[PDB]
Amino acid sequence: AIPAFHPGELNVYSAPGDVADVSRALRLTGRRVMLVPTMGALHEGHLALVRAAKRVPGSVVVVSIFVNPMQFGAYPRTPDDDLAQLRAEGVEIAFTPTTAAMYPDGLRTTVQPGPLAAELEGGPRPTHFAGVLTVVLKLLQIVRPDRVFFGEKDYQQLVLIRQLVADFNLDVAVVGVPTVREADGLAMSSRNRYLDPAQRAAAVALSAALTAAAHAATAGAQAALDAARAVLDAAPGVAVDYLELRDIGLGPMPLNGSGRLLVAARLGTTRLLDNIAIEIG
Amino acid sequence: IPAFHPGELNVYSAPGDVADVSRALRLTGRRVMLVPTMGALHEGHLALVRAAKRVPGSVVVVSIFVNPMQFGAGGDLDAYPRTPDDDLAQLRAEGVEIAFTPTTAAMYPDGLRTTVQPGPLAAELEGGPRPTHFAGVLTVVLKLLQIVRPDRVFFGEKDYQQLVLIRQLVADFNLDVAVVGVPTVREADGLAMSSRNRYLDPAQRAAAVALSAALTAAAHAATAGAQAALDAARAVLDAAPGVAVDYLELRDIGLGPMPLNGSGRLLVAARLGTTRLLDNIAIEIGTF
Ligand SMILES: Nc1ncnc2c1ncn2[C@@H]1O[C@H](COP(=O)(O)CP(=O)(O)OP(=O)(O)O)[C@@H](O)[C@H]1O
Ligand SMILES: Nc1ncnc2c1ncn2[C@@H]1O[C@H](COP(=O)(O)CP(=O)(O)OP(=O)(O)O)[C@@H](O)[C@H]1O
Ligand SMILES: CC(C)(CO)[C@@H](O)C(=O)[O-]
Ligand SMILES: [Mg+2]
């Protein structure tokens, strides 16, 4: 028998088989299942993902809350508050599995990403994306959503998930949602709370550098890169790990055309990242 | 949706075509059965097909694809037997409605990019000397399952380690498909059917009976314990001319990090000339 599902209410399921059965039943009833993968501690950035999923006609939104140990090398856990926010957004399904339910046999079969996973964010964390793709593949198989939502803020992650979907012939649409930003441009992130006042003010340099580059781009790729570097060079205590212009699939940037500029920097012990669309010329 | 002529063999090479047809069939209530093969079909494959065919209201999809990823450098890939015409004739004779025959470019348009990394069992037995073989197998099977989205997928017990690894793949990635193992089909004297049997000359073919003879002798000797079972198999293999044993191992049925306790599987791999043959059998320790 299919588990109970109360429309218009937030239905919480912890067992994978339960959400799998409900999702299947709902799709048969005329709903389009939308999956929004999270690790909890929800903020406006996550709500933008949720709102994107909810606006699809016939949508039933499934928000997974799962701190995936495999993508780590202390993590904030606010169950009650996260669920309240989801209820406030009109989300009808929350999937909150335990590590044991997701990995009943430990790490055995896993996903091995292509070479892009060793670059950029993969430099300091070479096994991070294998963890991300493995848990995302599992969530996709459990929930079987029509569309899955990820923030553009973690652009490399978004691109790797598009590679996962294409490479494994997955029947799901991957939707990238624009980065939600604080009033001064800083990309919203749970980790921002760790920045002291001086670091928080200096942190504006990442987004300022990216938007400066996007507008400098009419003058060419070098102009865009040099403008971004100048902005980052005007900030104290911002240790840039990388500032790279690539094509939209993160391969080498074209002579002209569309691309993406990505930056990551360390402010004290907090690593921040950001990125932006760039049109060369 | 491409054309689907019921009661006839429909051949599709494009992944999108078989995906669309399978989806359409599933939507009308028919249950889709997938039998993955690398072609060069023989009675062993037909047993998988018949097992699939008997599921009520099923539509059977047999994929034929010599997967380059599971072959290690060498002329192994080029040497693999290919008999496409006889294969399709056999499927028609079996009443199969769908054959999926993708091209290498359709399956690997981006070369080897995202792939499946099997658990530790993949580095053992068959994987010892071929460390990337099972990643090739699991990657292609994962793709075939996503393309066809069958309710059940059929594999032969002959390649027992492969069957176990596919069950791991399905469990580990939460795949919504039932894995069905089908008993090994054998020639009248016991030889496990295999497309590689065609490389045994008359003498090697005669000597090859030793693998199955050794396994069945071991299964009956097992009432006396594991040592008796293994020694009986070894004696039969040792009495066989021109049979070079690669390995003979008795393991728990899951072939995993668990000691043998009552129910096991005895696996053997041996070379007759350049032909490497495999076989395995269920073993019950201390049971008559
Ligand atoms: N500002 C933002 N705008 C849009 N999506 C965002 C976002 N911040 C995070 N997301 C998305 O929310 C999902 C969950 O990612 P998390 O890492 O759990 C949250 P986070 O804010 O990035 O925390 P973190 O600072 O610990 O990394 C991802 O798809 C992520 O890209
Ligand atoms: N004798 C047999 N009985 C039952 N299933 C068999 C079988 N021989 C092969 N199969 C199964 O048929 C499927 C396809 O395997 P193939 O590699 O295409 C044929 P093969 O005969 O095993 O070729 P090979 O000798 O070149 O390895 C596998 O699931 C395999 O285990
Ligand atoms: C499972 C399989 C069809 C994958 O190519 C192949 O390994 C085989 O012949 O068993
Ligand atoms: Mg994050």
Side-chain angles (χ1 to χ4, degrees), chain B residues 36-38 67 70 137 140-141 155 162:
Chain B
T37 81
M38 294 215 299
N67 176 34
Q70 66 190 73
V137 172
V140 83
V141 169
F155 284 97
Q162 165 171 279

Side-chain angles (χ1 to χ4, degrees), chain A residues 96-109:
Chain A
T96 57
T98 63
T99 292
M102 291 296 281
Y103 298 106
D105 296 288
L107 294 178
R108 190 164 59 180
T109 313

Side-chain angles (χ1 to χ4, degrees), chain A residues 108-110 112 138 167, chain B residues 113-115 117 143 172 174:
Chain A
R108 190 164 59 180
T109 313
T110 61
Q112 172 172 114
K138 287 167 62 67
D167 296 349
Chain B
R113 192 168 58 181
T114 315
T115 60
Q117 164 71 61
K143 285 162 67 65
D172 294 351
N174 305 89

Side-chain angles (χ1 to χ4, degrees), chain B residues 10 18 42 45-46 60 71 200 221 263 275 282:
Chain B
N10 293 269
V18 76
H42 57 60
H45 301 101
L46 301 190
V60 177
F71 290 80
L200 302 166
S263 293
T275 307

Side-chain angles (χ1 to χ4, degrees), chain A:
Chain A
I2 298 177
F5 175 70
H6 307 297
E9 287 182 27
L10 179 57
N11 296 264
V12 185
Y13 309 95
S14 288
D18 281 356
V19 75
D21 292 336
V22 173
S23 174
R24 184 174 315 108
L26 284 176
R27 185 139 206 298
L28 290 183
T29 69
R31 295 264 220 142
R32 291 293 172 266
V33 181
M34 303 299 116
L35 174 62
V36 175
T38 84
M39 297 204 301
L42 312 176
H43 56 63
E44 289 304 305
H46 304 83
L47 300 186
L49 267 40
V50 167
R51 291 163 193 162
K54 186 158 239 61
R55 73 154 74 274
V56 178
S59 67
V60 59
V61 182
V62 175
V63 176
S64 59
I65 294 173
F66 177 65
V67 183
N68 178 36
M70 199 182 166
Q71 64 192 72
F72 284 64
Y75 201 77
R77 286 175 168 291
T78 47
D80 336 77
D81 185 37
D82 288 341
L83 296 187
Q85 291 194 72
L86 295 180
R87 205 168 289 117
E89 290 302 319
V91 166
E92 291 167 295
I93 298 176
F95 174 42
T96 57
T98 63
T99 292
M102 291 296 281
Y103 298 106
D105 296 288
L107 294 178
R108 190 164 59 180
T109 313
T110 61
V111 173
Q112 172 172 114
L116 172 61
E119 309 180 65
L120 305 167
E121 289 305 293
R125 305 184 176 183
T127 67
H128 172 69
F129 289 119
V132 175
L133 290 197
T134 298
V135 80
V136 168
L137 175 60
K138 287 167 62 67
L139 290 172
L140 287 172
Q141 297 300 320
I142 293 163
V143 179
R144 297 174 218 80
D146 292 287
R147 307 186 195 189
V148 63
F149 300 72
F150 293 95
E152 286 188 356
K153 186 190 64 176
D154 299 284
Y155 196 78
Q156 183 175 15
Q157 162 170 283
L158 174 56
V159 173
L160 284 167
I161 292 166
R162 290 178 171 136
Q163 295 188 354
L164 171 79
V165 170
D167 296 349
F168 288 166
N169 306 94
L170 303 187
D171 182 27
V172 60
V174 178
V175 181
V177 177
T179 299
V180 177
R181 301 175 177 282
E182 294 296 352
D184 64 0
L186 179 65
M188 290 192 189
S189 208
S190 298
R191 72 187 65 181
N192 289 347
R193 67 199 176 200
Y194 298 126
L195 305 166
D196 64 30
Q199 302 168 327
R200 172 64 180 79
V204 67
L206 278 69
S207 60
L210 295 173
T211 57
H215 290 85
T218 54
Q222 194 63 59
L225 282 159
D226 292 348
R229 181 62 68 172
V231 174
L232 296 165
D233 282 337
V238 175
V240 179
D241 279 343
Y242 62 76
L243 170 67
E244 294 196 17
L245 174 62
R246 302 276 195 94
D247 64 36
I248 63 174
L250 299 185
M253 179 63 147
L255 304 182
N256 73 301
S258 312
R260 203 79 184 187
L261 178 60
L262 308 97
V263 64
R266 286 174 300 96
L267 281 74
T269 58
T270 306
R271 177 187 184 80
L272 302 180
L273 82 191
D274 202 349
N275 70 85
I276 196 169
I278 297 288
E279 299 312 317
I280 292 303

